[PDB]
Paper text:
The innate immune protein human surfactant protein D ([name]-D) is a collagenous C-type lectin prototypically associated with the lung surfactant but now identified throughout the human body. [name] recognises a wide range of pathogens, through their surface carbohydrate arrays, leading to rapid deactivation and clearance through activation of phagocytic cells. Numerous studies of the binding of simple sugars to both [name]-D and rfhSP-D, a recombinant homotrimeric native fragment comprised of the neck region plus three carbohydrate recognition domains (CRDs) which exhibits significant biological and therapeutic activity in vivo and in vitro have been carried out both in solution and through 3-dimensional structural studies. Here we show that [name]-D recognition of Salmonella enterica sv Minnesota rough strains R5 and R7 (rough mutant chemotypes Rc and Rd1) [name] occurs preferentially through the inner core Hep-Kdo, with [name]-D having the flexibility and versatility to target the terminal glucose of R5 when the preferred epitope is not accessible for binding.
The trimeric rfhSP-D structures comprising three carbohydrate recognition domains (CRDs) and the α-helical coiled-coil neck region have been refined to 1.65 Å and 1.75 Å resolution for the R5-bound and R7-bound structures respectively. In all but one of the CRDs the structures reveal oligosaccharide ligand in the Ca1 binding pocket. No ligand is present in subunit A of the R7-bound structure while the mode of oligosaccharide recognition in subunit A of the R5-bound structure differs from the Hep-Kdo binding seen in subunits B and C of both structures. The bound oligosaccharide is clearly defined in the electron density of both structures; Kdo-HepI-HepII for the R7 and Kdo-HepI-HepII-Glc1 for R5. The Kdo electron density clearly shows the 2-oxobutanoic acid sidechain off C4 in a beta conformation with respect to the glycosidic bond in both structures. In subunits B and C, in both structures, recognition of the oligosaccharide by rfhSP-D is primarily via protein and Ca1 coordination of the 6'OH and 7'OH of the dihydroxyethyl side chain of HepI. For both ligands where HepI is coordinated to Ca1 (subunits B and C, both structures) the Kdo (anhydro) interacts with both binding site flanking residues, forming hydrogen bonds with Asp325 through Kdo O6 (2.56–2.80 Å) and with Arg343 through the extended 2-oxobutanoic acid sidechain of the anhydro Kdo. In all subunits where the carbohydrate binding site is openly accessible in the crystal (subunits B and C, both structures), HepI is coordinated to calcium Ca1 as reported for the H. influenzae Eagan 4A –rfhSP-D structure with KdoI extending between the two binding-site flanking residues, Asp325 and Arg343, both of which interact directly with the bound HepI-Kdo (anhydro) unit.
Numbering used by the authors:
A (entry chain B): 204 to 355
B (entry chain A), C (entry chain C): 205 to 355
The structure:
Amino acid sequence: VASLRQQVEALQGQVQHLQAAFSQYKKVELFPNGQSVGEKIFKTAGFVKPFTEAQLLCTQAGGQLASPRSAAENAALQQLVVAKNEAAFLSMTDSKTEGKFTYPTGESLVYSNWAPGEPNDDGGSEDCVEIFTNGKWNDRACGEKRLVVCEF
Amino acid sequence: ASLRQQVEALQGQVQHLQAAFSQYKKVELFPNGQSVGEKIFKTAGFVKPFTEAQLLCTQAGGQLASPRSAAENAALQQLVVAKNEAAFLSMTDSKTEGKFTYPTGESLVYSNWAPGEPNDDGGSEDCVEIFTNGKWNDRACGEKRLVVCEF
Amino acid sequence: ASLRQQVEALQGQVQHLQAAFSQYKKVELFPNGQSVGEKIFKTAGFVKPFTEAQLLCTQAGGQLASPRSAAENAALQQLVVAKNEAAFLSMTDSKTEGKFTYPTGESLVYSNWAPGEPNDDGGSEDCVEIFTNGKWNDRACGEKRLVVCEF
Ligand SMILES: O=C(O)C(=O)C[C@@H]1O[C@H](CO)[C@@H](O)[C@@H]1O[C@H]1O[C@H]([C@@H](O)CO)[C@@H](O)[C@H](O[C@H]2O[C@H]([C@@H](O)CO)[C@@H](O)[C@H](O)[C@@H]2O)[C@@H]1O
Ligand SMILES: O=C(O)C(=O)C[C@@H]1O[C@H](CO)[C@@H](O)[C@@H]1O[C@H]1O[C@H]([C@@H](O)CO)[C@@H](O)[C@H](O[C@H]2O[C@H]([C@@H](O)CO)[C@@H](O)[C@H](O)[C@@H]2O)[C@@H]1O
Ligand SMILES: [Ca+2]
Ligand SMILES: [Ca+2]
Ligand SMILES: [Ca+2]
Ligand SMILES: [Ca+2]
Ligand SMILES: [Ca+2]
Ligand SMILES: [Ca+2]
Ligand SMILES: [Ca+2]
Ligand SMILES: [Ca+2]
Ligand SMILES: [Ca+2]
C-alpha cells in the first residue's frame, strides 16, 4: 500500500511538468496564425481558396471552416483577418434554401454579424459568407477566393 | 487509504490534458502536416537542395520523409499536392549505385517508382523525389525540392 | 489493489502523453522555432516595424526576442540565419538616449554589439536588430525587420 503512495506522488510531478510545458507550447503554437477563444481555436492557412476547396481543407484536417457563434468568437476570428488583411470564408451557406443560412450540420444560425444591407444575394448568386477586416459579414459568391480559416 | 481521491483527481487532470493536447495536435498539423499511424510529416514550405534539406531535418530531430508503406506514401502525397511541389525523400543510392537505402543503410521495404524509374539519368541521380501523383523518381541531389521532414 | 489497477492504467496514459508531447515539440519547432533552456524563440516568418512587431508578440502572450546570454543569442541567431533577415530585439533607448533597456525598464544584463555600435545613426536609432552573424546593431524603429517572439 505504501508502494502506491510513491507512484501517485511521482505521477503528480510528471503531470505538473507536462501541464507547465504544454501551457508554454500553446502560446508558441498559435503564434502568429491562431487564436484561442473559450474552448475553440481558429487557425489560418495563410492563403486564399474558393469555398469548396477551403471547406475540404478544414474537414480533411479534422476541423471545419470558421463558424463564430458569439461576439467573442467573431472578434477572435476578426484578429486573424486583420492580421492577414484578407477577408475569410465562414462555414455557413444558403445553398440549400436561398435566404436561409445554415451551418454544415443544417442548423440555423445562433449568431450573425451582417454588414448593413446584407445578405443581398448580389447578381442572384451569393451563397457563401465572408467576414471582413471590420468583423462584419457579407454574402459572397462561393467561387471567389478568400482566406482559409479553420476551427478546431 | 484515501489515495483514491488523489488518483481520481489526477486522472481528471490527465484526461483534460489528453483532450487539450489532442486539439492542439490537430491545430499544429494544419495546413503543413499529416499524421499517419505514429509518424508525423511536416513540410518547411520551401525548397532546398538535398544536403541542405537533410541537415534541416536532422537538426530538427527528425529525418527526411521516408514512406515505408502505401498509407505513409499517400499521406506524404497530400502535402506535396497541397504545395504543388515535388519533395525529397530520405533515401539515396550514393554508396552502391542502383541500391537505394534509408539513412541507416537498410535496403528499401517499400517503393513507388514511376514507370521507367529509377534511371540514373545523366549518370548522376542518387536522390529520390515524390511527385504530386505520389510516384517516385530518382533525381540529382543538387536540384531544389520541397523539404518535408518526418518525426 | 483496485487502486493498483487504476494507477497502472494512469501510468500508461502519462507515459504515452510524455512521448506524444515530446514528438509534438519537435514538430512545432520545425522550422520556425528554437528552444534554449526554458525559453522558446519563434519567428512569424515576416517583417514589421518595431511597434507592430512588439504588439504582435505581447498579444500572443510573449514579447520580442530578448537574449540574455550567449547561448540564447546563438539560438536566436539560427532563426535569423534560416530566414536570412535581421530581426528586432525587445530592447530600446527610447526613454534615455544611449541607455538601452528591456521593456520592464531594467538595464541590459547581456549584449553583443557589432563593432562601432550602438551609433544612433542620423540621431534616430532607438531599436535593436540582430544580424545573421548574431551581432547587434541599433536601428530606426520605423524600419521593417523579422518578427521573433519569445515565450
Ligand atoms: O467589392 C464589392 O464589395 C463588390 O462586389 C461590389 C459590387 O459592385 C457592384 C456595385 O453596384 C455590385 O455588383 C456589388 O455591390 C453590391 O453588392 C455589394 C456586396 O453585397 C457584394 O457581396 C455591396 O457592398 C454593394 O453596396 C454598396 O454599393 C451600393 C450601390 O452604390 C451600388 O450597387 C450602395 O447602395 C451601398 O450603400 C454600398 O455602398 C452593392 O449592394
Ligand atoms: O545598412 C546599413 O548598414 C546602413 O544603414 C548604412 C548607412 O549608410 C550610411 C553610410 O555612410 C550611414 O547612414 C549608415 O552606415 C553607418 O551606420 C551603420 C549602422 O549603424 C546603421 O544602424 C553601419 O553598419 C555602417 O558601417 C558599415 O559600413 C562601414 C563602411 O566602411 C563600408 O564598408 C564599415 O566601417 C562598418 O564596418 C560597417 O560594415 C555605418 O557605420
Ligand atoms: Ca442561391
Ligand atoms: Ca444566397
Ligand atoms: Ca453580398
Ligand atoms: Ca551514383
Ligand atoms: Ca543513382
Ligand atoms: Ca530519374
Ligand atoms: Ca533617441
Ligand atoms: Ca538611440
Ligand atoms: Ca546603428
